[PDB]
């Protein structure tokens, strides 16, 4: 009665059902509803998470247990990472457990890797598609993603499906050139009509023109020093710039120039966040600048209004979105996939 | 590569690997190590549980998330139950170094086995299987997997000393079904089924019994003090496992108060959890100083503090700990064959 | 000169209370403040009374457990710090500690109270906050006697406030205790204060001697650290024509219980709602509810009794009995402490200048 | 039986009457070291996680912090409150420290947190300085520069002048406004007549830079959100030792020392001295904005567990950086010591509480 959906199976389901329309009509609505559902009864749906460092002498992994009990999506996400897993290349490893919302029976076990990357990319586009519609005329023709891996992949993939006619060049930036070139190839083979280039953080002058010709910038890095520099971004107010930052999850992690973060604060710009509580306790871009909850707006709240001059720096046309991750994202998207994935893309277990 | 171990897979592995030697040499030591490991750094090994009642309508189910991070057994047991009744969930086993998913167990059989293994872990220490003053009958109040695994493990351990097993329940159907499965399995043992009200019929069997097990969700004591053997020449070990909330009780509160006022220490799995969940201790007013943990019985002596000298009776109350499920789940995961598991590649 | 702090000692609190406690004062001043605190807390619980910190002493020569209970209400900000345990009980100290009152805007220290009298008064004020609402002082179905199980300050303030409120309706007060010494001392002190009321002292074992008074009683108070029910169902009046209100305050740990567990189970199976101060704290601290299996849905908070008028959910029609269980809330100590600090005269306080 | 209210003036009295080089080394510093080491041994059992709650009043911007400490010998709680409104009124962080009986939990002492916090913070600063830069050192510049004013700067300077009497000849107080700086120069001048006290503005760089380049001890007591202590203002000769104790930062957006020096120290593998690696990495902007990790940090008590200090010294300059965020054990161990040693002349004793 349970289904084990592996990382490959998730990517299969997504690749088979992810289109511009599907994102707008199926995926995004579920995530928006989950984010709104969570915001209504936050402490009852996502109880305080349990974080425990490994009690094994041969491991530096920290295990975090994040339960989610929504009216419709019930379960638990357990993710684990740290130096050893990072150095070994495994990174954050774990799974998402989906339960019956009425009985509590085990219905699905997902691999958290792909699921986390997809829900994070769907959250980034949930705000991007709201502030910069795909019919907008103020979009520069290039996209720059700082980072590699599943996070950068799904961010690029989803954005290329949404802004197909407007994005012609994708620039992948990373600390090491190996994994960046690996992503450039995989994305190049998948999207033939898009030119994919890979740069190193030191190849400034070489990517700086591309960064100044970019309207969508993605932060998918575990950086402790800002990789997106204010002087590398377009400063023309006629063109809109939407920066979705997802990499930082600790106060010492930051991706966007702290001067720009302070400039946005002093200029009265509200930053888009997934959760004001978590971002002001986990996002170094906000923690190191002294941002307050009143100068923040949550993604679901962007769909409750149409006035967005509060989230835009009028001197440059720049908008900042910071995502830290929420278990409702994993549970609402995992429940959706579980109820629509075919047995060809799932390990169905009978008599569990 | 993770492995889905279903209830049938667990019972298969267990029935295929459970012997007196296996219990004494492999299974019991793992639980003792888990209980000992937990007792050293309790809040670091088993963090406080997360309990949230359904935020969904048309449901009265409460979901409980119990993480366990031992040096060797890492994961979480998620159980959910409540009105509209049973308790369903699963146990997740992770790689102790990477945090990758290694195993998914069904909590049903795994919980019953570890509870029965915990009951015998204290029993075999106080009433060794080589005892010569052991009454020949066993009485288990309850049915289901809990009663089954309790009886099977005890009958494998005290084979030559236990000749009659009496199954007691509120309904006689599930009692006779357990008599059948255990009767076909143990041909040299007489299995009898009784009702909780048929006192005049089971009182002789209860007074000819040295092992009494409480596997019932009763809210009123089903094991009565005057139905037990009171001869100081014979030892009696009562393991209570059914109660998990303060309003649930299985053993006569008069016997509980006599043991308290006579200075008898009750064997427990965890003093903290039992004094917050077991009605036998909460409704009698027991204190931590008059309690002893199962793992502590293997690190010291008894001093007869866990035995009432006027009756020869020993009382053990177990409420359950996540370390029990994960230490036994890791052992099964590392020893279960691919025939008894759903092996998933490239998870 | 600078900023000033106020040290209000136990004697200072009792002086203020004895000098300002009247039927009108309780109805018009003290109870209203407590009701507002309970309602304010119920609105934003986790922000006003944050989760308490409990730590057992890290000293070897000590078995004391320290509890830190902060309260940040819109008007009453501070913390109540209480510490107790076996050694504290063996020495007669019991729960010792203090209540800190802060400036609601700046956070400067304004007052330091002794927790003893303050806790006892607010607990008794909570009992009458529900009692005066369910059993009005003009009620016509009330027996003429009151029975309090226990002695000490808790029993004292419970009796005193109830006798100031129900002057003509309570004629005999029966004090029950494990020892008769402390019971007779309370009869004396309360007898000197209330001349028109008959005070009698009995032992918990002198059944048949107090049962007639217990069956002629409409208000029963539980002020005992009992771990075994001292208020037994067969000693209480079971006549539905007479109203009985049982306010229990003694139990604060799951193994502590004051009311017959049979009656607790009878109330559960009959669908009766029990009055509590806080559903969360009572279901985690009161043995009367934890050992009976009570649920939040079959409970009602005291302040909520002022949000409805259908008290048939809190009354078992088979007996006419109502049960109220109090475990304690930090908001109670601070809302009453803030009131006292803002109304105490310099004669009944040690005013410290330039703190 | 009685409790004791110890007011700010009472604390300053007791300290001024009992603070000497020997007293600091033989009584005050040892108590703080024991508290810091005792805390590090069983941290979560002595100082449980603090409760922080913002005002639920609509007419206040103050946030209240409740910090209990349950050590084997010092038991109680520190309550501090601050915020925008409190700072705009000259109040700042206000609160008190409660000392309880270590066996019964009865109220034994109530301190004002203001002076008590400043003293223990200054005692923490000197606990690391006296270990890395002994008072007999010959590579100590003769000037001291303190960035900040108030109680923090006062106790920091006083303690250093009692300890390095023969080595400190000029003290320069720097602040944004000259008012509180001139008041501090006066009070400290009357106490230390043989020391030259000067007051400067944060903008008078051309006037204090020569003094800053002749300074070996620099104290940061400012609530700055932008670094006021600039790398180009420090002495760069490795032949002279420089010890910088930073005290102002308590939130990640607050920084006092040039982030270039913080970034250089990190990339050059220099370990910075801290009171607690956990709290500093969650509250100190000098460490959070530099990306420092616990492995590149050393705690104050740990400086007394070794004798090689080349890991905490930049060899290119001879500079050592120490960052303090505050720990409740410091307030409670100093509150217990004073309460158990203060005479009734410097305390308001309340009987029959
Ligand atoms: Cl396959
Ligand atoms: Cl307690
Ligand atoms: Cl915090
Ligand atoms: Cl803060
Ligand atoms: Mg909303
Ligand atoms: Mg001392
Ligand atoms: Na409520
Ligand atoms: Na000179
Ligand atoms: Na490391
Ligand atoms: Na050490």
From TrEMBL, chain B:
CC annotations in GO: cytoplasm
Ranges in a coiled coil: 158-192
UniProt keyword Coiled coil, yes or no: yes
Keywords: Coiled coil
Domain of life: Eukaryota
Keyword Coiled coil: yes
Family that this chain belongs to: Belongs to the ornithine cyclodeaminase/mu-crystallin family.
Name by which UniProt lists this protein: Ornithine cyclodeaminase
From TrEMBL, chain D:
Coiled coil found in the keyword field: yes
Keywords attached to this entry: Coiled coil
GO CC term, one of those recorded: cytoplasm
Coiled coil (UniProt feature): 164-198
Alphabetical list of InterPro entries matching this protein: NAD(P)-bd_dom_sf, ODC_Mu_crystall, ODC_N
One Pfam entry name: OCD_Mu_crystall
SUPFAM superfamilies: NAD(P)-binding Rossmann-fold domains (SSF51735)
Top-level taxon: Eukaryota
PANTHER family according to UniProt: KETIMINE REDUCTASE MU-CRYSTALLIN (PTHR13812)
UniProt record similarity statement: Belongs to the ornithine cyclodeaminase/mu-crystallin family.
Protein name: Ornithine cyclodeaminase
Organism: Candida parapsilosis (strain CDC 317 / ATCC MYA-4646) (Yeast)
Species classification: Eukaryota, Fungi, Dikarya, Ascomycota, Saccharomycotina
